[PDB]
Design a protein around this ligand. Structure first.
Ligand code: CM5
Ligand code: CM5
Ligand code: CM5
Ligand code: CU
Lengths: 227, 241, 101, 241, 101
């Protein structure tokens, strides 16, 4: 959805989508589908829409209810942004693989840097199943065969929970003692060094040297599990 | 004399109910502030694994994030010998980021949490707090802390993202797994060219690109720290108008 | 006539002021996920000896914003809370120093 | 006591010869100033009917024009409860514009007066003056006046230009009559691309474009008003050096 | 020796000063369709008690311009006339208040 709000002449005078083909319009979680067709880059492209020297072939969906397993212009994979040129006609294919059950109005589209979203026609496509079925396997150049929908997720949750709790520590090492009114009085009254004791003083050097240590080693241990 | 309390014990119960209410307040208010600032300056690299590069992310995230710590240290340390200044901030950010990535990015728009996990700032926030508590000198904390804040940022994050930097021969083209995540989980409103990651130069040498960026981030981080300490002192001011 | 109140009452009120400053801190958090910003500043000037000679600067920053001259300014404005903290404690510190010797 | 005058009546004749000389002066000096400022900031949309669009003209003209009123109000109202502050300015502008469009644009270079007639600012100048006289509050005049100044600008002008917005099938292309005037009466030194009128966006919806612009102009107009009130207070200062 | 002049004479002169400030206002108008800007400031300092402790700030703006640090500055400089008005009347107000009670 969303293109009925755009200026009419824009949509007429911008990119022309024709000969579209949708290889399904109901699909099950992990079953892929194919949108392919042609598009024309109208040589009378509007002033206030940058010529498409830097454009990207997206799809319009609310979140990755599909994943984009592939997309081609001219039989070249286009994961990065491309240069299109006014006047020319291109053919395209996008390989969508379903992920989240629902009734999805799938738009093929073209983001034009300095321009906006140029929105092609959408057809309802229905996914059935449970999204928990979704699996996104990849064979790495070291292979190793991973699932990219969960790979490294235990490492992020691990390391983030560690450093957060390491932080909460530091804050509770101190909020053990009284924090504000007594420390205030203490400082005003000329007695600020009384509040950082020598245990304090390098409990501090522990956390410091610890954090640097836990960094340098797990650093070195990462350039081993993934050389 | 006359007393607000009716017993020494009451004076200690009250002076520590205030510790909670203020802790709660300065935690959440500075959360809101710090999180908004960080979302608009560094936030874009922080949302996606295929923006966490070696040139820009390594530069932007330290510089923008050292601000509020240097502000909060400025008041808390020198007015109260409080030494969890940087860490209250980085705690507040990550809590705010994480609630937003889990219940919203993944929660309501289904992005895999391993695509949208945040940056990790907490190593520098501890080395910063401590370097200030020891030494008790704004300048040494600016120079030695600023360099610390930048040089530590990529190490503190490389054990998390490195899995996603193993390459892949996908449909004919080399991509990292991070790149695969970006290609796969369709960002309808965030197309590829928006992403500001390193792309090479003819005046450049490749890796090393990360260490060179980390140091530059360290130097700018000391400048940002001087600035933001004085800004914090200004911010901690009891003057009336 | 509330610049001469029993020290127990003044403190009971700095307690209420922080109930406002706490609710406000929640609103500010749901903000990044304006009413109380008056409900509190009012109180501190209405009913609290410490804030009687005319509006705190940094308390203002916490409620005004960039409207003293993007939205990062509304962000940097939260650091104004340090000024209000610094005032409140300096006030509470004086009211309970005794007392905690 | 000793007197500059020799009769109460003389003291009233003099105190009202000064009313004329000052009225004359503050009218013409502020004319010259206001007109120059307005010519260089808003002046370009103000010369031609085929520049009076819905995006830019609706934005620029209020913002640039509310300045001097807010300056002159600042002194006249608070130093003298004078309440024709905005109107002295807008009177001075239009007189200066009109002498220039009639005796020069049309006068010496033959442009049809219905091509080069000015913008109309006087509705906002009255709603502004009055909103200040009632209420006697700079802030309410800034907020309620600023919005008034912007939201009224296009209505106060649409009854004049609307005739020129009926379309025409000229040599195969749709043009408004305003467009026809621009195409016809040859501006040798002001070719078409110089003109900054609305052209559409892919991120935009068409009409409404005028109301949305008018409000934006209203908000920026309150900011311009705060600024230009203080600038006016500064300007009305009897300090010696 | 013209900070002690008969109130009738001082006023006769504030009358002449406004003949200059009027001619100047015409020059400024023909400008947007520099001599008198001195002929007047001179007078106000030459021959008028009110402007004796050394040059009016905003009177200067009306004659200098941006030369205190485009041409929009020469425009904004006209608002300096409010400062000269504010001075002149405050002076005339004091000389005729009596008189108009
Ligand atoms: O159990 C005996 C101790 O208890 C009392 O002090 C407690 C306090 O009453 C108790 O309330 C306090 O709690 C500390 C943690 C409370 C805040 C926890 C954190 C919230 C999250 C981030 C940082 C702070 O810790 C102190 C010591 O652990 C006594 O007053 C102490 O003298 C005594 O040593
Ligand atoms: O705790 C015993 C105390 O009772 C009185 O003060 C109370 C007050 O009567 C009492 O009303 C008040 O309670 C504080 C509760 C804080 C509200 C917490 C949150 C409510 C919802 C979310 C935001 C704020 O503060 C004091 C206790 O914390 C006396 O004034 C004190 O001297 C005495 O020590
Ligand atoms: O009108 C009677 C007055 O005569 C004397 O002052 C005269 C002066 O003698 C008289 O010379 C002077 O005249 C003002 C004329 C203003 C010149 C007008 C314009 C000339 C051409 C374009 C620009 C300026 O001002 C006063 C009258 O306006 C006395 O000083 C007054 O006290 C007395 O009331
Ligand atoms: Cu649709």
């Amino acid at each position: 959805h969303g293109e009925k709000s755009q200026a009419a002449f824009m949509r007429m005078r911008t990119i022309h989508w024709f000969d579209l083909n949708w290889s399904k319009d109901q699909v099950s979680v992990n079953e892929t589908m194919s949108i392919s067709g042609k598009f024309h880059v109208f040589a009378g492209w509007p002033e206030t829409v940058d010529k498409p020297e830097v454009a990207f072939l997206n799809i319009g969906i609310p979140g990755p209810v599909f994943i984009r397993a592939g997309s081609w212009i001219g039989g070249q994979l286009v994961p990065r942004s491309v240069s299109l040129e006014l006047g020319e006609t291109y053919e395209f294919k996008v390989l969508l693989k379903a992920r989240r059950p629902g009734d999805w109005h799938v738009h093929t589209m073209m983001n034009v840097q300095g321009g906006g979203p140029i929105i092609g026609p959408g057809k309802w496509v229905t996914i059935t199943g449970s999204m928990g079925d979704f699996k996104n396997p990849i064979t790495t150049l070291t292979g190793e065969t991973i699932d990219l929908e969960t790979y490294a997720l235990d490492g992020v949750y691990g390391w983030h929970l560690f450093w957060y709790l390491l932080g909460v520590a530091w804050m509770v090492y101190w909020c053990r003692k009284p924090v504000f009114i007594p420390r205030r009085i203490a400082v005003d009254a000329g007695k600020a060094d009384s509040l950082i004791t020598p245990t304090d003083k390098k409990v501090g050097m522990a956390f410091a040297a610890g954090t640097l240590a836990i960094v340098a080693v797990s650093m070195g241990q990462a350039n081993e599990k993934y050389p | 004399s006359q007393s607000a309390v009716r017993s020494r014990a009451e004076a200690v119960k009250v002076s520590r109910t205030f510790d909670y209410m203020i802790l709660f307040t300065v935690f959440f208010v500075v959360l809101g502030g710090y999180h908004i600032h960080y979302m608009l300056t560094g936030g874009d690299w922080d949302f996606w694994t295929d923006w966490k590069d070696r040139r820009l992310w390594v530069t932007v995230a330290p510089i923008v994030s050292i601000t509020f710590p240097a502000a909060v240290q400025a008041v808390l340390w020198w007015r109260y010998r409080i030494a969890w200044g940087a860490t209250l901030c980085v705690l507040g950010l990550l809590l705010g980021e994480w609630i937003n990535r889990y219940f919203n990015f993944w929660g309501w728009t289904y992005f895999p949490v391993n695509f949208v996990f945040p940056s990790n700032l907490m190593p520098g926030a501890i080395v910063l707090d401590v370097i200030l508590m020891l030494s008790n000198s704004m300048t040494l904390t600016a120079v030695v802390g600023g360099l610390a804040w930048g040089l530590l940022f990529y190490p503190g994050n490389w054990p998390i993202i490195a899995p996603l930097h193993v390459p892949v021969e996908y449909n004919g083209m080399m991509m990292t797994l991070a790149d695969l995540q970006g290609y796969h989980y369709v960002r309808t409103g965030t197309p590829e060219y928006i992403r500001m990651v390193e792309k090479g130069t003819l005046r450049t040498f490749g890796k090393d690109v990360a260490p060179v960026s980390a140091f530059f981030s360290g130097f700018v981080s000391i400048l940002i720290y001087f600035l933001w300490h004085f800004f914090g002192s200004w911010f901690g001011s009891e003057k009336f108008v | 006539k509330v610049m001469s109140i029993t020290p127990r009452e003044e403190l009971r009120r700095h307690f209420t002021h922080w109930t406002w400053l706490m609710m406000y801190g929640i609103a500010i958090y749901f903000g990044a996920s304006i009413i109380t910003g008056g409900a509190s500043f009012l109180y501190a000037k209405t009913r609290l000896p410490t804030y009687q000679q005319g509006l705190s600067l940094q308390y203002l920053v916490v409620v005004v914003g960039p409207f003293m001259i993007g939205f990062v300014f509304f962000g940097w404005s939260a650091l104004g809370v340090l000024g209000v903290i610094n005032i409140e404690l300096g006030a509470l510190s004086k009211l309970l120093k005794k007392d905690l010797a």
